[PDB]
Design an enzyme around this catalytic site. Sequence first.
Site, PDB file in Angstrom:
ATOM      1  N   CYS C  94      33.214  38.512  45.471  1.00 53.15           N
ATOM      2  CA  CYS C  94      33.111  39.486  46.545  1.00 53.15           C
ATOM      3  C   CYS C  94      32.507  38.949  47.844  1.00 53.15           C
ATOM      4  O   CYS C  94      32.982  39.263  48.937  1.00 53.15           O
ATOM      5  CB  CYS C  94      32.315  40.684  46.044  1.00 53.15           C
ATOM      6  N   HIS C 346      37.864  47.626  49.566  1.00 51.88           N
ATOM      7  CA  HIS C 346      37.101  46.420  49.293  1.00 51.88           C
ATOM      8  C   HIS C 346      37.976  45.215  48.971  1.00 51.88           C
ATOM      9  O   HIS C 346      38.128  44.842  47.808  1.00 51.88           O
ATOM     10  CB  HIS C 346      36.125  46.645  48.136  1.00 51.88           C
ATOM     11  N   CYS C 376      26.421  42.988  46.860  1.00 54.83           N
ATOM     12  CA  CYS C 376      26.326  42.466  45.501  1.00 54.83           C
ATOM     13  C   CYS C 376      27.571  41.647  45.200  1.00 54.83           C
ATOM     14  O   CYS C 376      28.586  41.763  45.890  1.00 54.83           O
ATOM     15  CB  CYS C 376      26.207  43.609  44.493  1.00 54.83           C
ATOM     16  N   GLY C 378      30.106  39.669  41.892  1.00 54.79           N
ATOM     17  CA  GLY C 378      30.460  39.682  40.489  1.00 54.79           C
ATOM     18  C   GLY C 378      29.747  38.613  39.683  1.00 54.79           C
ATOM     19  O   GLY C 378      29.427  37.540  40.196  1.00 54.79           O
TER      20      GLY C 378
END
Lengths: 239, 390, 390
Positions: C94, C346, C376, C378
Amino acid sequence: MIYEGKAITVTALESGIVELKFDLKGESVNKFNRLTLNELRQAVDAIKADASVKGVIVSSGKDVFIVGADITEFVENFKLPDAELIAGNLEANKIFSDFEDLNVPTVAAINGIALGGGLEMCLAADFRVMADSAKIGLPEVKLGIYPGFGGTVRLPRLIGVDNAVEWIASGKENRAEDALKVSAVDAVVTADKLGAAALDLIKRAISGELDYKAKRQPKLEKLKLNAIEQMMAFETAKG
Amino acid sequence: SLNPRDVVIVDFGRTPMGRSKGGMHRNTRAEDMSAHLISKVLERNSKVDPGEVEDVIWGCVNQTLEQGWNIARMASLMTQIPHTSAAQTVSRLCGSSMSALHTAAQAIMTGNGDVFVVGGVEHMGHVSMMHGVDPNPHMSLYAAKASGMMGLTAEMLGKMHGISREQQDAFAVRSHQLAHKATVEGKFKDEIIPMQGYDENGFLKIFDYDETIRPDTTLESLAALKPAFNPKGGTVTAGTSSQITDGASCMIVMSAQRAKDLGLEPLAVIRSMAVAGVDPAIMGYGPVPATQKALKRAGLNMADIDFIELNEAFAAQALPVLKDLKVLDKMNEKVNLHGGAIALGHPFGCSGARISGTLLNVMKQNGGTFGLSTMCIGLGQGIATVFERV
Amino acid sequence: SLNPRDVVIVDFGRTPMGRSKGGMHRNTRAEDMSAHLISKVLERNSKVDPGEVEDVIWGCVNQTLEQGWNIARMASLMTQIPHTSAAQTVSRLCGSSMSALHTAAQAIMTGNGDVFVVGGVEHMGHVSMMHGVDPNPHMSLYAAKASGMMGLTAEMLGKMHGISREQQDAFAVRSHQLAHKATVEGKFKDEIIPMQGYDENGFLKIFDYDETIRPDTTLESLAALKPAFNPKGGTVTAGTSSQITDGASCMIVMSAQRAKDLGLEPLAVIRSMAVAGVDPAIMGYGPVPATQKALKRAGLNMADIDFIELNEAFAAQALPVLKDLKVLDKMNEKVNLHGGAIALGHPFGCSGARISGTLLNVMKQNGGTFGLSTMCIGLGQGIATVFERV
Ligand SMILES: CC(=O)SCCNC(=O)CCNC(=O)[C@H](O)C(C)(C)COP(=O)(O)OP(=O)(O)OC[C@H]1O[C@@H](n2cnc3c(N)ncnc32)[C@H](O)[C@@H]1OP(=O)(O)O
Ligand SMILES: CC(=O)SCCNC(=O)CCNC(=O)[C@H](O)C(C)(C)COP(=O)(O)OP(=O)(O)OC[C@H]1O[C@@H](n2cnc3c(N)ncnc32)[C@H](O)[C@@H]1OP(=O)(O)O
């Protein structure tokens, strides 16, 4: 109507837009014979001279868009002396080139098959909307020749060198799906909503939303590839 | 002296390059290969706390399947590296592994870390170099679709620089020979990290050598080979090309200050870094542009460097580089002394730091001072690093 | 003042987030999307010579098919960016897009460049987030195979922090509304770059809005939704989760000195960067560890920051973050003012810089000074940046 021929009818539409439709009366298809060409010449001159036109659309009133001319006429033409043949094709190309230089957004509404000249005609227009069932290709090499109406000129500048060679050298017919993937056609729709998609796109082109002048430019200037990339892409294509 | 923020290499360890086609790594995953290599390298240098690993930067190209989803973290999780540490997978095609080293270094220098772990993996047996490739038609519009096939890009550089099939095959037999030589004399012992593998029959055992190396290579045997890329009139063959190798490389890096504190002799000190671009067609020429930029930053002349480690993508490409770099005449004296990718393989994600690592050892063995690790990249790129033993 | 090596952002441009499921980008490739976005962003700032782009750092996760083989270069080749320039694709799941920004910055600071172009793309319509995934059994040995399913990692953080289904759905309807609000008032006009797309029927046209946004979202409608991850007793649903979006973000960055010379007002100035790791199970808690590290480097207190842009991975995860960061009470006053990923989508490779970009605009619009973009990651990671308008 603005123009009324036996193979081409330039009918006026809303917002000053106009639709140029290929409906060869008496036959079952559409092909670029002496008449068809001579009329398109007149059809363009009518539009180009009509200061009211703000948008042009290219349609077909048959099951197919525009297929190839009678093989008969081919035999004939290629019999003529070199200087005459070339002079004959130059005049034919000007018809298209002029239509390409129209100070008005032009869209090709590919409803059905468009082979050789049929496709070369579309390559002239700015944008192109094709039916999901239609097909387009340049089956010239199958006759021992290659695109004669600016095919080898526009295609490479539209879909790319590697693809233009892959399309011409094979003369294969290309389906809608793969036609958009290589950007030969800008938008794909269904047979029933094709006319709508075309008319819509035009308006947006006219409204200035879509820079039709910038989309046409590419096939008026030299290839984009570098000098190394040309040699790379070409020498391999030949090999 | 060494400034507190200088980038110091603490150690280098690589796995025994194996044959992708039914080799020693045929049953070993890319992640477990990387996670392992890293675990072992850390175990050698116990003075460095794995908890301090600010970021695990790993290089990998075909990031799908096993190598997908930031394999950098996937590996760090199966290591003694705490969950508190970070991880990112850098991809710059062939040069991925070396870019990782750079990224970290830059991090250490800017004060956003103190101890990083950089490496690279590439299991071409499990993730073929041609697996999951969707050619974009729109590329042919701005470049040559043919510039993709790496072999052809070697063909072109070869012709433009007139490299003969004889010259190539010769350089080939050289790589194997020198690689084998170095293997025997255990000049690879220090950098190679033993690892579980499976021989032909599938017997579980430990490997500490490189399967890739084929000492029975001779101008007579390479002459028999047929053009691998250009059918009618080809010069580049499967013999003068790098091997499809399953391998991983690893490195531990940290500031000069932290290194001073923990008290441990550096394996080398990075002095400059650089990258450069070239036409996709002649991508093999990437090393020269990048090397120049690197040296210029290092403030040195190609003549101040004692040993070079140029990745052997293709013979037809490696040779021109050396020539234009004006060091071809100095080859056997200071170039790929322990052999190259033609004999050691070329695991994309790994190769980067691999040659960078091997280069450091060649310096530590022959008493070198400044080394240069450079390599061409796919689609037209170059990258090189300039270390210094001190 | 601004030191010659400070990292200055020159501009930020993003594509109109579209629905992966038959959206406006259904016929647009990831590469052509990125190459395009970049071309347009550059055209806006003509004073910067594309020939100076030292390196094109792009973020992308599922690097296979269209997004494979260092898509960074594939894009740079179809732009006005010379072949002389470099390119690398960074993957940190991400946070890929944001790590790119960092990598470049660090480069600019160390003196290994002057003008970089960082962005990120992610076409989830063409490369599903579950495409080409080979779960490694050896993972279950050191961690939880379940920690992979992002939705479950939200479930756990939610329970441990006691986030109610009501609280989540509420935050959801907030993202959509605020996003819609900002869209209308053209608070997105400056950052959104118009782009060709295709409506339902497939008509070619230009988009300048976000399809993702669904203004008809109400607590009454989100209540009807069913647990998307935990069947029997779930809190996280498809409504409180980020959307599968096809999108790309772009940014032009350069030293403060080069920026001074060319003469152009900065969009912001990076003051600190950081990354951190957390347990794979509670990956959504990544922002807090990274934020702290970032602020500490910035030499500021969470109270000195005027506006925040926290990526909305999940409601059940975004909320705990704000809470523990001690800014939940300050939400509507300085957090995701233009909406978040719940309404804007996203796109993995993109999101990173996306929020970092939008955050800069929120500052330029409400007269902010220090902004914080965090998110945050993964498998357990965190990353954040701290910019300053001046
Ligand atoms: C940009 C950068 O920095 S990196 C450059 C990127 N390079 C590449 O992508 C090239 C990678 N190489 C390849 O993909 C493959 O090696 C290819 C395509 C060149 C050839 O592959 P193939 O067509 O499968 O041929 P293959 O690899 O099987 O080998 C051909 C024969 O040569 C033989 N051979 C190869 N090397 C040697 C050698 N050193 N000595 C003797 N025989 C040899 C092999 O044993 C084989 O014979 P066999 O079939 O009887 O066993
Ligand atoms: C670490 C980080 O920073 S990033 C976090 C990582 N996040 C992710 O990977 C995202 C994971 N989520 C997903 O993959 C998908 O969204 C899933 C799995 C949750 C759901 O996908 P699916 O199983 O296909 O179910 P689906 O999305 O179709 O269900 C949505 C339904 O709710 C409805 N719905 C969704 N959002 C809303 C809303 N805001 N208002 C009203 N209805 C809504 C839809 O209309 C649909 O109903 P329909 O089928 O009648 O049209």
